[PDB]
Design a protein around this ligand. Structure first.
Ligand SMILES: *[C@@H]1O[C@H](CO)[C@@H](O)[C@H](O)[C@H]1NC(C)=O
Lengths: 54, 173
């Protein structure tokens, strides 16, 4: 793909308060630089090619 | 349809009545004329606006849901998402078809109802002073000028004033 025969597989992990992230690795780790905040609410996603209007 | 006034004993509607839904046409010694009846028209309108009020501008907010289009074949999980959506779509579609058929049936009938009520009210006012000619019109058996006609429409007609006169005319030989 774009001249690259190797691959990366992406995973995710949610960590609750009072809990702890533990990473044990002996190679091939593609490390996170941090975390995303996760919220709840009315948000969503839609696939569309319609232009945005004012 | 169900009361049998509109599309019934009333042969047809009057296209020239543009200032109300129900009203009166008369003929007398001074001529023939027309006036809308405001209260019956409004009664019908009020009922129809009520339906609209339940239906117009009352949509439900939905946000994140499930996906409904798919670029890859996936089987079991995908079948269910599609089936869930089709099932949902079919049921909402059913309620709407049924809703409109039902609403429409009730509206023609309620409008038929309002026409009949105005006829019936009119019938009662005239007491023994008029006879039902059978097509929604009354033959009034006394001299009845514009003021007289106006009084019937205005609900102030005094049957006692004309009763003697009318009876002589009705029960002639
Ligand atoms: C009904 O008749 C009464 C008595 O004359 C009068 O006061 C009133 O104006 C009439 N109503 C209408 C709307 O013609």
């Amino acid at each position: 793909i774009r001249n690259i025969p190797s691959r990366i597989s992406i995973y995710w992990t949610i960590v609750k308060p009072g809990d702890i992230l533990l990473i044990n690795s002996t190679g091939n780790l593609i490390a996170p630089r941090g975390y995303f905040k996760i919220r709840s609410g009315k948000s969503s996603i839609m696939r569309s090619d319609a232009p945005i209007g004012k | 349809g169900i009361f049998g006034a509109i599309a019934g004993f009333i042969e047809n509607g009057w296209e020239g009545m543009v200032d109300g839904w129900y009203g009166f046409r008369h003929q007398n010694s001074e001529g023939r004329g027309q006036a809308a009846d405001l209260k019956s028209t409004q009664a019908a309108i009020d009922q129809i606006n009520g339906k609209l009020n339940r239906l117009i501008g009352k949509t439900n907010e939905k946000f994140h849901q499930i996906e409904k289009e798919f670029s890859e074949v996936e089987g079991r999980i995908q079948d269910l998402e599609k089936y869930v959506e089709d099932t949902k779509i079919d049921l909402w579609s059913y309620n709407a078809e049924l809703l409109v058929a039902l609403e429409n049936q009730h509206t023609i009938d309620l409008t038929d109802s309002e026409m009949n009520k105005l006829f019936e009210k009119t019938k009662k006012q005239l007491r023994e002073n008029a006879e039902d000619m059978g097509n929604g019109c009354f033959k009034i058996y006394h001299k009845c000028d514009n003021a007289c006609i106006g009084s019937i429409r205005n609900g102030t007609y005094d049957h006692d004033v004309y009763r003697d006169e009318a009876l002589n005319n009705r029960f002639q030989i």
